[PDB]
Amino acid sequence: SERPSPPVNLTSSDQTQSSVQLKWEPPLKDGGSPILGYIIERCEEGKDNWIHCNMKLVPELTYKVTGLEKGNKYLYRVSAENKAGVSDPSEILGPLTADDA
Amino acid sequence: ERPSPPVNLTSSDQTQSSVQLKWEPPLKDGGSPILGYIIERCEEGKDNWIHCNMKLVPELTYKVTGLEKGNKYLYRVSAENKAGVSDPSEILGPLTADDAF
Amino acid sequence: SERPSPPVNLTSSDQTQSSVQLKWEPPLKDGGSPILGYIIERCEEGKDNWIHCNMKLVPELTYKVTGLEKGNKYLYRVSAENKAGVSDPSEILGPLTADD
Amino acid sequence: SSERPSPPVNLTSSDQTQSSVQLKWEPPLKDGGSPILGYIIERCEEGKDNWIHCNMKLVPELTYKVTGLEKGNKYLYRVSAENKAGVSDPSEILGPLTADDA
Amino acid sequence: SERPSPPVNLTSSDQTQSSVQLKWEPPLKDGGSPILGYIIERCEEGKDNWIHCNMKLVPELTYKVTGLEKGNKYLYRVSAENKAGVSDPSEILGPLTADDA
Amino acid sequence: SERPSPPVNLTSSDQTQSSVQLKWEPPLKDGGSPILGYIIERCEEGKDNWIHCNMKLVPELTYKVTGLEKGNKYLYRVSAENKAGVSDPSEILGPLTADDA
């Protein structure tokens, strides 16, 4: 009937100089319609614009962000989409630095 | 004394007739170990909370069954020790009883 | 360039009369440098002092606390460290009773 | 261009009576790029599964007195924010709160 | 019917060497019965036991703690009571040092 | 003996085309020393840099941000300082648009 609530508990792992593994939990409210997938966005320091990380909807609760530039800091957020619309983005993750560890 | 509520109640494997719930233990056990958990659900179109499990669930997960296809459900979980039962966790849902994804 | 933010969602499992397994998620902000490891602290009821549990940094997101006294209640908190410094401790977990 | 704002936060109550309650909240942390025009207050009674609009016109303030409560009943409350782009998700739910004198 | 939920958003102001002004918001859930009042407790560092500050229930949403010792650090928590019982305490405030601004 | 915790519940009111009134609550933990004051920072969209708004520490729990440009979006955060050091900034407030209500 309506858009779902935001995904919750966005977290990270496997941070490298060029990628990072994001993980989250599903919305607490689906808005009355099943979740079709998720939209991952990232924002780099030095730019005020949020970029889409996945082209097609991600049906998983995890996603590997790629294309990171070494030494840069990045913010991350993830939204959920159903037939009714797209949720507000989760709470922002980051700044996380693109370094090997 | 009674423990604090369970935290971070989440879901997975939503079907037309069931859903897998998962949570984390209380941050405070009130001075006595947790004996188990009490799972409750509430359907839309009805104002009463129903007990899902008969005996206490000692695990941190539980499969709710007996859902009606297409209906929306709320969920909450409490923790019990020798002293009493905690307040319920944060409410999960509305979640629609449909085969997800 | 600066200290990271606290670890988040500190939780517990596998509580025994002498040990407990702690688990957490990494800081939301690393302060510009990778996380080197974590510092686990505990505080017993009947004492107002926080104690370090691990000597060397824990690079993992989990750690088994040992040496607990039967029947006692304990508080727990974990911090993250990078080359710049140590974060504020996470939200306090506990009191958790040391019983099987 | 713009988008809906984030939900109002910290919805709380005061002056609970047999027939009314004073609701209070804080503005969204994100306005979506356009000023907040006002707020939409909703309530849900126990014994009914439907959310009801309490105010007809938008409330521009950060407070609003809900009236028409039935003595002894329990009520849930939530508030949303609206700008030119749309209406936010409702805040976290307040209640059940019983309409009774101390 | 049942005990209320904990008071929320416990905060402070007007910290002195002998007192502090506490303020909070009412429970999100009253358990089906009005809140009769609140119970303020404090715990000093160097002592492991929580002490009751007020004898009679406080019907207001604020209360001035007195009798603090200069230089000492204190923890604070507040509970709500209705005809059914007393809630879990709010989130703990402090350590706050008993010193003049 | 150590820095305080971040200020909490940073909120806004009286948004205009050139100013906004910020308000917050004191740290939950003062680190064992009184709070000397607060440091207010803002960041404009289209720029990745946080700017200090106040020169001298603000002892109050509120502050009027000025110098905003009409139509621009701004982020805000506030830190607390004692004799031991400066806290991590509070949770970020914004984006909030500089426009007359």
Side-chain angles (χ1 to χ4, degrees), chain A residues 1-22 24-44 46 49-54 57-68 70-72 74-82 84-101, chain B residues 1-43 45 48-54 56-67 69-71 73-81 83-101, chain C residues 1-22 24-44 46 50-54 57-68 70-72 74-82 84-100, chain D residues 1-9 11-45 47 50-55 58-69 71-73 75-83 85-102, chain E residues 1-46 49-54 57-68 70-72 74-82 84-101, chain F residues 1-46 49-54 57-68 70-72 74-82 84-101:
Chain A
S1 185
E2 88 185 17
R3 62 179 177 272
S5 59
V8 295
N9 286 335
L10 178 61
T11 185
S12 61
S13 69
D14 302 2
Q15 177 73 70
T16 75
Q17 88 194 343
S18 64
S19 66
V20 66
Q21 180 117 24
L22 298 181
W24 60 93
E25 288 172 1
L28 291 73
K29 314 170 168 63
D30 59 15
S33 186
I35 305 280
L36 275 36
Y38 299 94
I39 296 137
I40 297 84
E41 295 178 279
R42 79 153 156 82
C43 178
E44 191 175 339
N49 60 335
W50 284 94
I51 288 329
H52 282 78
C53 291
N54 56 306
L57 273 174
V58 176
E60 287 82 50
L61 301 176
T62 187
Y63 174 81
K64 186 180 181 181
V65 181
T66 64
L68 306 181
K70 194 213 305 142
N72 286 98
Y74 291 79
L75 308 176
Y76 303 97
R77 68 190 187 184
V78 60
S79 301
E81 178 174 349
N82 60 8
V86 186
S87 66
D88 293 348
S90 69
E91 301 293 280
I92 296 171
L93 185 67
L96 306 193
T97 310
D99 278 320
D100 289 330
Chain B
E1 65 189 0
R2 60 182 176 272
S4 59
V7 294
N8 181 31
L9 177 61
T10 184
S11 59
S12 69
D13 299 1
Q14 178 74 72
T15 78
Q16 101 170 40
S17 64
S18 65
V19 67
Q20 190 75 33
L21 296 181
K22 177 223 298 183
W23 59 93
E24 298 166 359
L27 289 79
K28 311 170 168 63
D29 59 16
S32 194
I34 307 302
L35 307 196
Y37 298 92
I38 304 167
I39 296 83
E40 297 177 282
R41 69 169 187 244
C42 177
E43 194 175 323
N48 48 83
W49 286 93
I50 264 50
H51 283 76
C52 294
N53 57 308
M54 323 195 183
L56 284 182
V57 175
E59 265 80 43
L60 300 176
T61 188
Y62 173 77
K63 186 177 144 183
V64 180
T65 63
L67 306 180
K69 140 71 196 211
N71 287 98
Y73 295 88
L74 288 60
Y75 304 96
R76 69 190 188 184
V77 180
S78 302
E80 175 175 338
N81 60 9
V85 178
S86 66
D87 292 344
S89 67
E90 333 272 2
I91 296 172
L92 184 68
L95 298 180
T96 311
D98 264 281
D99 294 335
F101 301 179
Chain C
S1 184
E2 65 188 0
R3 62 179 177 272
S5 57
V8 295
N9 195 12
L10 178 61
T11 184
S12 61
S13 70
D14 303 85
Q15 178 74 70
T16 78
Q17 69 177 248
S18 64
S19 65
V20 67
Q21 190 75 32
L22 297 180
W24 59 92
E25 288 172 2
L28 299 189
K29 314 167 170 62
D30 58 15
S33 184
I35 307 303
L36 298 173
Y38 299 92
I39 304 167
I40 296 83
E41 296 177 279
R42 71 178 199 210
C43 177
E44 190 174 272
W50 286 94
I51 302 302
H52 285 255
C53 295
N54 57 306
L57 294 164
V58 175
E60 291 76 24
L61 300 177
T62 188
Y63 174 81
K64 188 179 217 87
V65 180
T66 63
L68 304 180
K70 178 184 176 190
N72 284 99
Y74 294 87
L75 302 174
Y76 303 97
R77 67 191 187 185
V78 63
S79 301
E81 181 176 350
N82 61 8
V86 182
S87 67
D88 289 348
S90 67
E91 291 293 339
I92 296 171
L93 187 67
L96 298 180
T97 310
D99 275 320
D100 292 336
Chain D
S1 167
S2 251
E3 67 192 17
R4 64 177 177 271
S6 58
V9 295
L11 176 63
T12 186
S13 59
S14 68
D15 301 280
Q16 179 72 72
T17 74
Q18 279 159 9
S19 63
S20 66
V21 65
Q22 188 79 34
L23 293 185
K24 177 213 281 162
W25 60 93
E26 290 171 0
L29 290 77
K30 313 169 169 62
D31 59 15
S34 184
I36 307 303
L37 298 172
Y39 298 92
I40 304 167
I41 296 83
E42 295 176 278
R43 81 160 174 260
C44 175
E45 184 167 335
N50 73 335
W51 285 95
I52 297 297
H53 283 235
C54 294
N55 57 307
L58 274 285
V59 176
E61 286 116 341
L62 302 171
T63 188
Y64 175 82
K65 190 176 92 169
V66 180
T67 71
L69 306 180
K71 178 179 175 45
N73 285 274
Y75 296 87
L76 305 165
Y77 304 97
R78 68 190 188 184
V79 62
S80 301
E82 167 164 13
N83 62 10
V87 183
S88 65
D89 292 346
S91 68
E92 89 283 309
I93 296 171
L94 185 66
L97 299 180
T98 311
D100 273 319
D101 291 329
Chain E
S1 183
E2 43 164 32
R3 56 170 190 271
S5 58
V8 295
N9 294 340
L10 176 60
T11 185
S12 61
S13 69
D14 302 336
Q15 178 72 249
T16 76
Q17 70 176 63
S18 64
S19 66
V20 66
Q21 190 75 33
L22 297 181
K23 162 158 55 143
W24 60 92
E25 290 171 2
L28 297 189
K29 313 168 169 61
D30 59 16
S33 185
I35 306 302
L36 289 177
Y38 298 92
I39 303 168
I40 296 83
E41 297 176 280
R42 77 165 181 255
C43 178
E44 192 174 338
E45 295 207 318
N49 62 335
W50 284 94
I51 270 46
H52 286 253
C53 292
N54 56 306
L57 289 175
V58 159
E60 298 101 343
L61 299 177
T62 188
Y63 173 81
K64 189 176 180 181
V65 172
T66 63
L68 307 181
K70 176 179 174 185
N72 286 99
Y74 294 88
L75 298 60
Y76 304 97
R77 68 190 188 184
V78 189
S79 301
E81 178 174 348
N82 61 9
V86 183
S87 65
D88 279 351
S90 66
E91 293 295 350
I92 294 172
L93 186 66
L96 293 181
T97 312
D99 275 319
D100 288 327
Chain F
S1 59
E2 60 177 30
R3 63 179 177 271
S5 58
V8 295
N9 190 29
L10 178 61
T11 185
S12 61
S13 68
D14 192 27
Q15 178 73 70
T16 75
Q17 74 180 219
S18 63
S19 66
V20 66
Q21 189 74 33
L22 287 176
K23 160 151 83 220
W24 60 91
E25 289 170 1
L28 298 189
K29 314 167 170 61
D30 61 16
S33 184
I35 306 302
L36 299 173
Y38 298 92
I39 303 167
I40 299 76
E41 295 179 280
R42 78 161 155 80
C43 174
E44 171 163 43
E45 295 221 314
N49 60 333
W50 287 93
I51 296 299
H52 278 217
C53 294
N54 56 306
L57 290 175
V58 175
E60 292 76 24
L61 300 177
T62 188
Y63 175 81
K64 189 180 182 88
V65 180
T66 63
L68 306 180
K70 183 166 154 53
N72 287 98
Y74 296 87
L75 302 174
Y76 303 97
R77 69 190 189 183
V78 180
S79 303
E81 177 174 348
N82 63 10
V86 182
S87 66
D88 293 346
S90 68
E91 293 296 290
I92 295 172
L93 186 68
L96 299 180
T97 310
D99 276 319
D100 285 323

